[PDB]
Amino acid sequence: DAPEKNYERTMAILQIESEKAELRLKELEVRRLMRAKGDGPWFQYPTIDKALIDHSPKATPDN
Amino acid sequence: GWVRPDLGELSKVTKVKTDRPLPENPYHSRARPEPNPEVEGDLKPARHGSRLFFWTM
Numbered sequence: 001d002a003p004e005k006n007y008e009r010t011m012a013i014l015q016i017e018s019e020k021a022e023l024r025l026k027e028l029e030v031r032r033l034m035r036a037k038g039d040g041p042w043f044q045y046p047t048i049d050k051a052l053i054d055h056s057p058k059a060t061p062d063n
Numbered sequence: 064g065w066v067r068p069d070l071g072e073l074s075k076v077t078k079v080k081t082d083r084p085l086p087e088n089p090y091h092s093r094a095r096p097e098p099n100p101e102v103e104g105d106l107k108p109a110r111h112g113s114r115l116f117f118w119t120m
């Protein structure tokens with residue numbers, strides 16, 4: 001292979017791997033922030049569905 | 064002149080005309096927390112695949 005081919009192929013390889021490395025560091029930072037704060041789509045541990053609540057007038061009024 | 068109610072009448076659900084206002088917050092609930100954001104957008108492929116150490120897909 002030519003030095004041109006090896007050179008520019010090395011540049012493409014280095015671009016792809018540097019971009020994957022930056023995305024891995026961002027993935028770690030996103031995971032840390034979403035576990036700490038809990039406002040992302042991840043770490044959403046379930047709560048009680050409020051569709052289960054009965055809203056009818058009950059037997060006694062004070063409720 | 065009073066008539067005794069028939070079997071079934073004193074258990075009817077009746078409508079009441081009131082002048083007092085309807086209670087707007089009878090449970091005295093405070094402001095609800097704002098929800099988490101929904102997901103939006105089109106689903107693009109993963110940038111350079113799985114990014115698991117060397118797996119290029």
Ligand SMILES: CCCCCCCCCCCCCCCCCC(=O)OC[C@H](COP(=O)([O-])OC[C@H](O)COP(=O)([O-])OC[C@H](COC(=O)CCCCCCCCCCCCCCCCC)OC(=O)CCCCCCCCCCCCCCCCC)OC(=O)CCCCCCCCCCCCCCCCC
Pocket residue numbers: 117118119120
């Ligand atoms: C018009 C419509 C149709 C169009 C058709 C166009 C295509 C025409 C050809 C069709 C056939 C295509 C076949 C698959 C394509 C080639 C894939 C390939 O070589 O990937 C290179 C891959 C990465 O190299 P690359 O230079 O970055 O990519 C070159 C290509 O661009 C690779 O491209 P890529 O970037 O897309 O690769 C994706 C990714 C690239 O890989 C990665 O991202 C890296 C991770 C790879 C796995 C690492 C695992 C490490 C731990 C396990 C170690 C295993 C040791 C080896 C086996 C031991 C004995 C079983 O691969 C994977 O994730 C797949 C996992 C590996 C399987 C590879 C395919 C095997 C198919 C045949 C299996 C036969 C048995 C072979 C032995 C079994 C193990 C391979 O290298 C390896 O995985 C090393 C092993 C070699 C792979 C097998 C070679 C394929 C042909 C085998 C024929 C001889 C069989 C001998 C007898 C049986 C064994 C005793």
